[PDB]
UniProtKB/Swiss-Prot annotation:
Keywords: Disulfide bond, Electron transport, Redox-active center, Transport
Name assigned to this protein: Thioredoxin-2
Family membership: Belongs to the thioredoxin family.
Organism from which the protein derives: Drosophila melanogaster (Fruit fly)
PANTHER family to which the protein is assigned, alphabetical: THIOREDOXIN-LIKE PROTEIN 1
GO biological process terms held by the UniProt record: cell redox homeostasis; determination of adult lifespan; response to oxidative stress
Active-site residues (renumbered): 37, 40
Pfam families documented for this protein: Thioredoxin (PF00085)
Gene that this polypeptide is encoded by: Trx2
Length: 111
């Protein structure tokens, strides 16, 4: 539910940087995704749901590793999906795997 998605897909590292500043103080969830990745697609509806539920305190940014290889390399991504949580450019936490409960827990504990 909470359809649509406030899940913006970054186009490049500069675009990501600009997205982070716009996020201001809000918790940022970087979702490293791939269209060919089964677990990544399985967790997508959850991310859409969360983006809407926490629109006031959270910004979900989708990073396609095939299109933004630099970003993936920068955050040393290897597992898919991988969630990196940031606030004011500071890394709060990170974990890999399509775990819906864990994703919501991290956001609830960091807003
Ligand atoms: Cl739920």
């Amino acid at each position: 539910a909470a359809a649509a998605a406030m899940v913006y897909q970054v186009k490049d590292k500069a675009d990501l940087d600009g997205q982070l500043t716009k996020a201001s103080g809000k918790l940022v969830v970087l979702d490293f995704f791939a269209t060919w990745c089964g677990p990544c697609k399985m967790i997508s509806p959850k991310l859409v749901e969360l983006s809407t539920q926490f629109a006031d305190n959270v910004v979900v940014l989708k990073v396609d590793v095939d299109e933004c290889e630099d970003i993936a390399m920068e955050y040393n991504i290897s597992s898919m999906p991988t969630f990196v949580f940031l606030k004011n450019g500071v890394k709060v936490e990170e974990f890999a795997g399509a775990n819906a409960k864990r994703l919501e827990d991290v956001i609830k504990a960091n807003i």
